[PDB]
């Protein structure tokens, strides 16, 4: 069922989503025993609104693996990219 | 669980 999808979010001025999870993140509202990074909220009319959705699991960002990544490390990485953030996400279809 | 701010 699940597929790895690639999307490009243009910071305008930010990505327009929140996340939960990661190593040390004490879980997420979707799959408690998955320690990965999950999108929790997408800003309507924001840069991610046609691309990402709550529940999506981010497993890569601009070539950097998000598998086994810590919670703050993922937040810092996403904050630090200055323009386009090409994401690979896992989504149930 | 811990949730980030808006990114």
Curated annotation (Swiss-Prot), chain A:
Location(s) in or outside the cell: Cell junction, Hemidesmosome; Nucleus membrane; Basolateral cell membrane
Q: What disulfide bonds does the UniProt entry report for this chain?
A: none
Q: Where does the PDZ domain lie?
A: 4-93
Q: In which tissues is it expressed?
A: Highly expressed in brain, heart, kidney, muscle and stomach, followed by liver, spleen and intestine.
According to the record's subunit comment, the protein's assembly and interactions are:
Interacts with ERBB2, BPAG1 and ITGB4. May favor the localization of ERBB2, by restricting its presence to the basolateral membrane of epithelial cells. Also found to interact with ARVCF and delta catenin. Interacts (via C-terminus) with DST Isoform 3 (via N-terminus). Interacts with NOD2 (via CARD domain).
Which family does the similarity line name? Belongs to the LAP (LRR and PDZ) protein family.
What is the documented function of this protein? Answer: Acts as an adapter for the receptor ERBB2, in epithelia. By binding the unphosphorylated 'Tyr-1248' of receptor ERBB2, it may contribute to stabilize this unphosphorylated state. Inhibits NOD2-dependent NF-kappa-B signaling and pro-inflammatory cytokine secretion.
The name this protein carries in UniProt is Erbin
- Source species: Homo sapiens (Human)
This chain is encoded by the gene named ERBIN
Question: Which span of the entire protein is present here?
Answer: 1321 to 1410 of 1412
């Amino acid at each position: 069922g699940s597929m790895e999808i690639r999307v490009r979010v243009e910071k305008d001025p930010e990505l327009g989503f929140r996340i939960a999870g990661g190593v040390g993140g004490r879980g997420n509202p979707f799959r408690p025993d998955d320690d990965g990074i999950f999108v929790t909220r997408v800003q309507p009319e924001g840069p991610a609104s046609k691309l990402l959705q709550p529940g999506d699991k981010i497993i890569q960002a601009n070539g950097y693996s998000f598998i086994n990544i810590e919670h703050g490390q993922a937040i810092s990485l996403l904050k630090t990219f200055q323009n386009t953030v090409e994401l690979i996400i896992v989504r149930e279809v | 669980y811990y949730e980030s701010g808006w990114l």
